[PDB]
Amino acid sequence: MRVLLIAGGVSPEHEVSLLSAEGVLRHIPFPTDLAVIAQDGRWLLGEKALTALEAKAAPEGEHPFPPPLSWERYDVVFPLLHGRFGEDGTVQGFLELLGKPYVGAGVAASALCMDKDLSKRVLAQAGVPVVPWVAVRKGEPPVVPFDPPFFVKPANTGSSVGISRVERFQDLEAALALAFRYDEKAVVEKALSPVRELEVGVLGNVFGEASPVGEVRYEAPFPGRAELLIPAPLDPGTQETVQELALKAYKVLGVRGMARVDFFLAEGELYLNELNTIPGFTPTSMYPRLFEAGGVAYPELLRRLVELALT
Template identity: 40%
Template sequence: MSRLRVAVVGGGRNAEHEVSLASAAAVVAALDPDRYRPVPLTIGRDGCWYDPTDHRASAPIGFPAALDLLQRVDVVIPAVHGRHGEDGSLAALCELVGVPYAGSGVAAGAVGLDKHATKLLAAAAGVATAPGEVLERTTAESRIRSFDGGPVVVKPVSAGSSVGVSAAATAQEFASALTTAFAVDERVLIEPYVSAREIDVAVLRRADGQVIIPPPLEIVVDGVFDYETKYGGEARFIVPAPLENGEQAALERAALLAYDAIGCAGIARLDFFVTPDGVLLNEINTTPGFTPHSQVPRMFAAAGVGYPALVDLVITEALASHPAVSNAGRR
């Protein structure tokens, strides 16, 4: 039986480039060589497409060549986190090419990366969220002058991997936090600091409608879960998260409501605060980090699904979710 050709796209023209490279490399390494033929592709920081298996030169292969490769594979696993990838861009490319792909579609990717839009849709579906204020660069100076103390958390509206996130309690810290966030995005979200447990929930809705929610994961960290804490080894992950009676059910219910409100497909990770008054949705990740040490694979491992099996599941569901797509005209 011929091997399935699996394109894995990593990198990206955004601040999450390195994280995306790690996710893509892990997926490629986990592909069973007897069943799959990996076709790795990298989007450089400059936006050019590269073939990372071509060691003869570092020159880009060009978008037409990358498009030709995508047209000749059986399925695509987009592993580009953040803008120009997770935001629906890669899903749109796969839709235009007519190739099955893993994960959420164009609309869900775009909404999911926009933290403010996510809050609005989640709230409309009955999921509580932390209050937030959107600030644009043109009004930043006046907002700094009116800052009446914190603590608050400042984050880019459209970015993941905790890039550009920082806390502020004074006007000076607030100004610095805005500078950091505006270096990543043109819009910034300001939220009151929530002193609560941080719990992640993974949701996978299969093509047949079956929903899989592995044990939730708790993030234990001193302060804000920013980029340095997330990838510097300072955070501690506990899975299964120790939860009181009813807390896990409340988390799963809120996660599924938000997942469906955004219109997600495949695997998504939903991040929550658990407070004495209930659960609050923090954000959603439609293309979550995907190394064996990332939160989602850890949660599935706790459910008995190891990393290679999880990659198999992702591919199986991508193919099942796009049954009308034929490779006949693309080979």
């Protein structure tokens, strides 16, 4: 068993990507090489890749995509990129053409989970609750069926950039103007508050298993550090409901390796907020920790991820 880990990427999650890349190498039960994608899009292989991982950042790379890499050497590829050219199906597509088995969601599932509009339409039709929303494209008159406040953000730029919290319809125009500079499509979601954030991990292909439910609480600013409460203090029924829904969405979307399913809990009602196909992998990330609590040692989690890649 030979595994190829690819980390970095030209997204803003570049460094956190390296951090989880480090977490994986220092715990994965297989011989694993590393390939790094620099912020300028160029790849770094071999030793130069390890240097990068040690500096936790690679501003510029050496090889222009597609890199002169010897894919025959690997049984499984473990993509660890985020956002654009990461969890959006493009790299997945490349690997499919190379004929290499890989960890995580395939082309369809990744591209769908990276589109706040299409994924909501699918989940809603399947019954899974999502926050009321509307999609608005550049050039078309905005039709928001709900009053403010709400969020305006580009549709498939899975980030925090471009997002704006509109309080009055009069500022909608400008909000859509901002997002339309990142994607021709944007979404307007009804803002909820008070609201709790629940997260659950899933592992397996299509039919997965849920980890325990955890919760994220942010501390006061001093950039308040995010607390990870596991298990989250829920009723023994609402938790199963979070797991049930996470698994249902996981199934309909056809996700394959893993995914962190994020939920909003506002005044007794749950809302599937986001399904992350490539979560964090630092032993400190909500992800591995949730499964640790579920009786799945970290090294064991990685083993199952690579094996699932071959089935």
